[PDB]
């Protein structure tokens, strides 16, 4: 029952895909029964939707959770506070963080503070088989996250989208079709590094766009 698993706003917003969420629940049970594992932990799978739907001002889109055991924590790109070294994508994100914003290197890879402040860290696919990158594509997550993005875009509220998962022509449509949605283009991914990602200034440009739409900027500062 969605209201059990996600925040009040999110439970209402995701009502249309409530059965598909239940189905993914049956999928993950079937995987354990079949002797395959999944990440992140069951209690972290919908973690992105445990922060207030109404407060979201930025969407960061990834593709799939980290396939390495102990990395995936149910926020796109985030890792648990004791994870070191950081995955490549997150080191790349943090290099852009310091360059764009001028802040020092974060103390750890926990992006929880971004989530608390209205950054939706959403992966298109919300589970993965450990050590098998992108193993859960086409298992039914795509409809769920599409609806989430659709719902978010439909709010009479400012939204900036950052696309770090390369599915631009998949996602540009839903978003472009909302009232007050700005999409950061182009769509370099963290692993494209110095071929487009570094200097993309996603953070400062999100804040310029929010203030331009009469919204408060995000405080991007991590501890
Ligand atoms: O394209 C991606 N790369 C990652 O390294 C990653 N990590 C994550 O949670 N989502 C994504 N998406």
What one-character-per-residue DSSP string does 150-188 give? HHHHHSSS-EEEEE-SS-HHHHHHHHHTSSSEEEESS--
Stretch (H or E) spanning 203: helix 202-212
Query: Nearest-CA neighbor of 217 among 118, 135, 122?
Result: 118
Query: Ligand 1: residues within 6 Å at CB?
Result: 62-66, 76-77, 87, 89, 123, 165, 189
CA 76 – ligand 1 centroid, Å: 6
Known catalytic residues?
64
For 165, 183, 218, the CA distances from 137, given in Å and listed in that order, are 13, 24, 31
Pocket test for ligand 1, best of 40, 45, 61, 77 (most atoms within 8 A of CB): 77
Tokens 């979201």 belong to which residue? 56
Q: How many residues does the structure list for the chain?
A: 223
> What's the token pair of residue 74?
């149910």
To one decimal, the resolution in angstroms is 1.9
- Phi/psi of residue 121, nearest 5 degrees: -90, 85
Q: What is the CA radius of gyration of the chain?
A: 17
Query: Hey, what are 196's tokens?
Result: 């487009």
Mutate to test the pocket of ligand 1, among 39, 47, 61, 63 (most ligand atoms within 8 A of CB): 63
Of 29, 27, 34, 41, which is closest to residue 130 (Cα–Cα)? 41
Task: Tell me the helices (H) and strands (E) count for the chain, helix number first.
Answer: 8, 4
Question: In 3-state terms, what secondary structure has residue 120?
Answer: strand
Method: X-ray
Q: Do 171 and 59 touch, CB atoms closer than 8 A?
A: no
Exposed, middle or buried by CB within 10 Å (0-12, 13-18, 19+), for 177?
Answer: exposed
Going by CA atoms, what residue is nearest to atom 5 of ligand 1? Answer: 89
Residue 120 vs residues 31, 53, 184, 195: alpha-carbon distances, Å: 27, 9, 15, 26
Ligand 1 atom 12: residue of nearest CA: 62
């Amino acid at each position: 029952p969605l209201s059990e698993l996600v925040e009040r706003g999110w439970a209402a917003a995701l009502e249309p895909v409530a059965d598909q969420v239940a189905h993914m629940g049956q999928f993950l049970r079937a995987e354990i029964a079949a002797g395959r594992r999944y990440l992140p932990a069951g209690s972290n799978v919908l973690r992105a939707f445990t922060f207030p739907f109404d407060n979201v001002r930025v969407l960061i889109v990834g593709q799939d959770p980290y396939p390495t055991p102990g990395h995936a924590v149910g926020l796109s790109f985030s890792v648990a506070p004791d994870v070191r070294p950081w995955p490549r994508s997150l080191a790349n994100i943090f290099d852009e963080y310091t360059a764009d914003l001028g802040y020092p290197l974060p103390s750890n890879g926990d992006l929880t503070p971004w989530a608390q402040r209205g950054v939706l860290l959403l992966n298109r696919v919300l589970t993965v088989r450990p050590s098998n990158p992108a193993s859960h594509r086409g298992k039914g997550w795509e409809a769920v996250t599409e609806c989430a993005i659709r719902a978010l875009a439909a709010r009479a509220a400012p939204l900036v989208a950052i696309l770090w998962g390369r599915d631009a022509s998949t996602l540009k449509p839903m978003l472009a079709a909302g009232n007050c949605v700005a999409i950061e283009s182009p769509h370099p991914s963290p692993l494209s590094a110095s071929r487009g990602f570094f200097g993309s200034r996603p953070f400062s440009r999100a804040n310029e766009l929010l203030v331009g739409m009469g919204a408060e900027p995000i405080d991007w500062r991590l501890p």
